[PDB]
């Protein structure tokens with residue numbers, strides 16, 4: 001029983017921000033969007049931090065395997081949001097957010113399976 005609820009905290013935080021991102025995506029404001037983008041970057045990387053930290057303390061390779069997959073995943077998300085750099089991301093943005101949202105929920109399944 002190690003690094004379970006702790007790691008979920010990262011996903012939970014990311015998902016919680018995504019909820020507001022959905023709101024601001026419909027709002028369509030650069031300041032709100034950039035600020036939220038900024039929040040995402042920090043939150044997801046904080047997730048990477050706890051995952052990477054736990055990875056180097058994985059009693060079982062399978063525990064690292066799950067962490068490593070999400071660790072890679074979580075950075076992938078940021079890379080996408082970073083690559084946007086605000087073009088005209090509103091309608092297009094919301095569509096992509098659905099994927100991030102479904103993905104992090106999948107991360108929960110990858111961890112808990114049945115939560």
Ligand SMILES: [Zn+2]
Pocket residue numbers: 014044073074077078100104
């Ligand atoms: Zn993420």
Ligand SMILES: [Zn+2]
Pocket residue numbers: 073074077103104107
């Ligand atoms: Zn993912």
Ligand SMILES: [Zn+2]
Pocket residue numbers: 010011014070073074103104107
């Ligand atoms: Zn995640």
